[PDB]
From a paper:
Here we show that the BtuB transporters from Bacteroides thetaiotaomicron form stable, pedal bin-like complexes with surface-exposed BtuG lipoprotein lids, which bind B12 with high affinities. We propose that TonB-dependent, lipoprotein-assisted small molecule uptake is a general feature of Bacteroides spp. that is important for the success of this genus in colonising the human gut.
However, BtuB3G3 incubated with excess CNCbl in the mild detergent Lauryl Maltose Neopentyl Glycol (LMNG) eluted as a single peak and had a pink colour after SEC, suggesting the presence of bound CNCbl. We determined the structure of this complex by cryo-EM. Data analysis produced maps of sufficient quality to build two slightly different models, named state 1 and state 2. Both states show density for a CNCbl molecule bound to BtuG3. A superposition of BtuG3-CNCbl onto BtuB3G3-CNCbl (state 1) has a Cα RMSD of ~0.6 Å, demonstrating that CNCbl binding to BtuG3 and BtuB3G3 is virtually identical. By contrast, in BtuB3G3-CNCbl (state 1), the EL8 loop has moved outwards to allow the vitamin to bind. The structural and functional data for the BtuB3G3-CNCbl complex, together with the comparison with the BtuG3-CNCbl and apo BtuB2G2 structures, suggest that the affinity of the CNCbl molecule for its BtuG3 binding site is lowered by the BtuB3 EL8 loop.
Residue numbers in the entry:
A (entry chain B): 21 to 355
B (entry chain A): 48 to 285, 288 to 331, 338 to 381, 406 to 700
The structure:
């Protein structure tokens, strides 16, 4: 008439240049999970972090950045960003005390700005000491609407889009650690990415019709790099909520969900009518493109209450592999 | 001595000593240990959800003094906000029996009432609860009666910082070095954060009797609560508060006019409910205000044609008004029922119940129900019974008018239920008293309301979700007198309740078909024991829940596993009779074996904890 459990570590060895599926998990349930898939042996390893550390990842596992041979794991709903070995999936350090981190970009081996939600300060941390250094003050920007997201380096400046309850792009100078420019874009820009033609690529979700901030037709934007200025705009009518823009290894073809995953080349002029994928019957959530071969991995959330799947297609559309991961897969990172 | 109203009905009743044993036990703690019901409750002073006979929370209708108490927006009630001493008589109606009194009770019905007192003169009671974790509980009682009046007043206050020591088997704290490297890992022992709470409950009762068959009453039940939301087990990092205040006033007026042959009852009531959500940290980060205005009315009749035949009629009407902001919606709820009970010979018994429901502007189909009872053998009171019905549950007010996702075109869920049971009652005079029952139930639910995402980008219920619920429920009560001063009582309940999702696969690859529903244990059993010797009292309570699945697919995962839940609570009571007062001393030990357990995913649990009560009942002239 008793109970037991506790965890037991097991050895892990990264045998190939695998892919890290960044499972978000539910929200206010603490069921975030991390997974590893090997594109060559066609074998997927789920719950790599729990089995290799005997302690759970957290809640709302957001994104992962791999630098050199170390991988940084962001847990949004636990104020913690990890640092794990990319070979044995073991913890070597952590950064805690954050407010609500989303994304991390390393300016150098010393400075790594961290984005947040529900806050207008961008954390500055030292990866080698796991200690908070300073904050970056975002103008006209408050806690009740706090939002920071994807950062893209361009020479000496970092561009970040303010997603949640925000409609502005911020350009940050790394040397002086202060914003220097701003552009006003549509409601709630989701993700920001960089191409070869030096044209900033992003989309704006309409967002939650009836929202206090407002409701609008989602759009797509292209922004010049050298001169921070809008260049071209696309409209995607009033339906659907686009998200998760991506590129390929060559940085010349654009991918985004908008129900029908759209595979369209860079420096085009119109949205192709045909869908790269038909948006069959489920609710896709994640998207990535291989930088070494060209495979397309599409993360399916199914019904948010069971294991999702990633569908692996080639650059032509040939089905290759369909494997299962944790609850609500949300992001990818390449080892 | 079967009551005619209780013909072919599977129900259980909680005795006085079951409800009046501790002042810290809400109805969540009562149902967990005293029945086979699954109660999803991750601790004390927390959101408790009841899943009954394999169904969801919304399929358990709750009525206090006749009027329905379920939240109009959600359709489900938090059983942890109802103190046990505020309930003087409670009953459970299983499945088809909920037709006799309520409407869309696909799972079952919980009926709560306060019997009038029988105390002459002035009296008082005061008990104080001194417990671990810096938890304090109080309960004050004031009563009076003069053969034509029964005035009562209760006030229950419970407060605690609610910060207990638990060991994290889901988090690990590291020991750094001189060069910010790693040295050793260890499972930390931390304290519950943001779990502080304080609750106030006041119940005022006025009962009037005329002595000519007319009885009057007025019950007012005011509730003030201020509970915070506990942090997750793996919630480390930082200047934080998150509270859910809740103000509720529930009033019921009653008048009963009995006669020599027939009886008519009329009741009316009013409920004001106000919820506030606050999320702030060092700033009005999030706000939410919910206001509910509710009016109630009911008229009931009951006529005897003879000792063998009985007819009843009843009309009810609820009116919910909601102005949730920080939008205007309402619904009238008529419910007429007619029942006829015929008892041809001493062994046979039939009962037919017809119900009519009209919620808002849509008419539900006629709700029939047949109850039959037969006596197999009077040697051991072997009695078998069977019932069958088709019941309908209307969509909740949220699913209809939820502004970004409301579809007022939903169809009410339908459920076909049939069950067969047996019972026995063999007792020996002042030696032993054994009774128990076993019933097999089978139910199919169609058009189960399931919120699902839409292509536009919002959520909307789409019915579907055929569900098959069936199983076996067993009850057993035992009492024995070992010696002239030792009395032993044993109460045991057992239930095997699968809940299979029979619906079509929503997508190409869903492992949910043919699987158990989330957070419903396949097996369940409870056992309670009581031994008393003179003024010494020892009580033992034990509950068992099988594995609970956290995913629809029932997939095996290391990070989503919930082991079978076995808990043991023991309490020793001693009573002292002084000259001017009576003192009752009891001490409660919860989590007796001190297992670092887990009943809800990634939510911390306390260890072994103690609770001490001091009870004073003055003895006047
Ligand atoms: C679909 C969804 C989700 N959402 Co919204 C997004 N994008 N959401 C929505 C959509 C509608 C939800 C709905 N109720 O119809 C959508 C896009 C409109 C929406 C909107 C919002 N969401 C927001 C955010 C950022 C979040 N959302 C997620 C919960 C993000 C979720 C990600 C995730 N991993 O869970 C999400 C993908 C899955 C929710 C779900 O269905 N869960 C399963 C469901 C069956 O269980 P559940 O727990 O009962 O789900 C309820 C809640 O999650 C609730 N909910 C949804 N969003 C929020 C936000 C908050 C603060 C709260 C308390 C509840 C919610 O929706 C469900 C009931 O419909 C989030 C984890 C996404 C992320 N990766 O950061 C994030 C929470 C961030 C954080 N650290 O707290 C918005 C501020 C964005 C915006 N401006 O549109 C806004 C919040 C509204 C508010 N209250 O102020």
């Amino acid at each position: 008439c008793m109970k037991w459990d506790y965890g037991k570590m097991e050895p892990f060895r990264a045998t190939g240049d695998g892919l890290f599926i960044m499972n978000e998990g539910n929200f206010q349930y603490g069921n975030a999970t991390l997974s590893y898939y090997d594109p060559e042996t066609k074998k997927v390893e789920n719950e790599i972090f729990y089995r290799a550390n005997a302690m759970k990842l957290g809640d709302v596992a957001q994104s992962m950045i791999v630098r050199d041979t170390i991988g940084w794991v962001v847990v949004n709903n636990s104020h913690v960003i990890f640092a794990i070995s990319t070979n044995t999936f073991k913890e070597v350090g952590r950064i805690t005390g954050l407010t609500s981190p989303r994304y991390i970009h390393f300016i150098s081996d010393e400075k790594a700005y961290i984005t947040q939600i529900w806050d207008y300060r961008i954390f500055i941390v030292n990866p080698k000491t796991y200690q908070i250094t300073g904050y970056i003050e975002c103008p006209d920007m408050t806690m009740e609407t706090g939002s920071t997201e994807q950062m893209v380096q361009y020479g000496k400046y970092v561009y970040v889009n303010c997603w949640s309850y925000q409609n502005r792009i911020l350009k940050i100078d790394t040397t002086t650690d202060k914003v220097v420019d701003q552009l006003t874009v549509g409601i709630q820009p989701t993700s920001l990415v960089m191409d070869k033609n030096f044209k900033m690529w992003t989309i704006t979700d309409g967002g939650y019709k009836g929202s206090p901030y407002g409701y609008e037709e989602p759009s797509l934007y292209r922004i010049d790099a050298e001169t921070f200025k809008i260049e071209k705009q696309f409209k995607f009518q009033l339906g659907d909520a686009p998200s998760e823009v991506q590129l390929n290894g060559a940085g010349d073809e654009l991918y985004w969900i908008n129900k029908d995953i759209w595979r369209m080349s860079v420096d085009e002029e119109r949205v192709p009518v045909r869908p790269f994928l038909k948006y069959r019957d489920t609710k896709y959530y994640g998207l990535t493109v291989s930088p070494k071969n060209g495979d397309v991995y599409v993360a399916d959330a199914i019904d948010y209450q069971q294991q999702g799947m990633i569908y692996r297609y080639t650059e032509d559309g040939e089905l290759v592999d369909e494997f299962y991961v944790g609850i609500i897969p949300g992001a990818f990172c390449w080892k | 001595k079967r009551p005619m109203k209780d013909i072919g009905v599977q129900q259980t009743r909680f005795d006085s000593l079951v409800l009046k044993e501790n002042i810290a036990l809400s109805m969540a703690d009562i149902l967990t240990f005293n029945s086979s019901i699954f109660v999803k409750s991750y601790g004390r002073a927390t959101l408790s959800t009841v899943s009954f006979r394999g169904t969801s929370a919304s399929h358990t209708q709750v009525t206090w003094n006749g009027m329905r108490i379920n939240n109009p927006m959600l359709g489900m009630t938090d059983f942890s906000m109802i103190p046990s001493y505020f309930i003087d008589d409670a009953s459970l109606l299983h499945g088809t029996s909920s037709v006799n009194m309520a409407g869309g009770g696909l799972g079952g019905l919980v009926k709560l009432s306060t019997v009038p007192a029988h105390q002459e003169g002035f009296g008082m009671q005061y008990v104080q609860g001194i417990g671990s974790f810096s938890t304090f509980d109080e309960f004050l009682q004031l009563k009076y009666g003069d053969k034509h009046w029964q005035i009562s007043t209760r006030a229950v206050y419970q407060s605690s910082p609610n910060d207990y020591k638990y060991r994290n088997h889901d988090k690990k704290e590291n020991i750094y070095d001189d060069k910010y490297n790693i040295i050793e890992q260890y499972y930390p022992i931390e304290r519950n954060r943001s779990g502080a709470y304080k609750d106030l409950h006041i119940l005022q009762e006025v009962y009037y009797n005329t002595g000519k068959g007319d009885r009057f009453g007025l019950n007012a039940w005011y509730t003030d609560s201020n509970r915070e939301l506990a942090l997750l087990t793996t919630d480390q990092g930082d200047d934080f508060e998150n509270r859910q205040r809740e103000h509720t006033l529930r009033s019921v007026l009653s008048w009963d006019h009995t006669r020599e042959n027939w009886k008519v009852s009329a009741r009316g009531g009013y409920v004001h409910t106000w919820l506030a959500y606050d999320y702030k940290r060092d700033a009005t980060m999030t706000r939410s205000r919910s206001k509910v205005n509710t009016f109630y009315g009911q008229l009931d009749g009951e006529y005897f044609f003879s000792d063998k035949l009985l007819l009843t009629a009843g009309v009810s009407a609820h009116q919910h008004l909601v102005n949730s902001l920080d939008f205007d919606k309402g619904r009238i709820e008529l419910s007429g029922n007619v029942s006829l009970k015929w008892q041809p010979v001493n062994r046979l018994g039939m009962s037919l119940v017809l119900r009519g429901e009209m919620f808002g502007t849509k008419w539900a189909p006629v709700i029939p129900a047949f109850f039959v009872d037969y006596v197999l053998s009077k040697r051991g009171n072997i009695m078998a019974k069977a019932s069958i019905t088709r019941n309908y549950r209307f969509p909740t007010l949220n699913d209809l008018y939820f502004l970004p996702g409301g579809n007022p075109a939903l169809n009410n869920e339908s459920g076909f239920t049939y069950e067969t049971g047996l019972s026995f009652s063999v007792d020996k005079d002042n030696v032993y008293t054994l009774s128990g029952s076993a019933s097999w139930f089978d139910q199919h639910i169609n058009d189960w309301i399931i919120w699902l995402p839409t292509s536009k980008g919002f959520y909307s219920p789409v019915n579907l979700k055929k569900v098959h619920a069936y199983g076996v429920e067993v009850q057993a009560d035992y009492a024995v007198a070992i010696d002239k001063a030792w009395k032993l009582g044993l109460n045991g309940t057992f239930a095997w309740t699968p809940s299979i999702n029979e619906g079509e696969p929503t997508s190409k690859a869903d492992q949910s078909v043919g699987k158990q529903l989330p957070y419903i244990p396949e097996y369940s059993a409870t056992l309670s024991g009581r031994l008393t010797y003179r003024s010494w009292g020892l009580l033992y309570k034990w509950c068992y829940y099988s594995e609970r699945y956290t995913m629809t697919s029932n997939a095996v995962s290391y990070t989503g596993h919930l082991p079978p839940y076995l808990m043991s609570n023991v309490t020793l009571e001693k009573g002292f009779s002084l000259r001017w007062a009576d003192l009752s001393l009891k001490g409660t030990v919860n989590n007796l074996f001190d297992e670092e357990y887990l009943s809800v995913l990634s939510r911390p649990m306390p260890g072994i904890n103690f609770e001490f009560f001091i009870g004073i009942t003055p003895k006047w002239g």
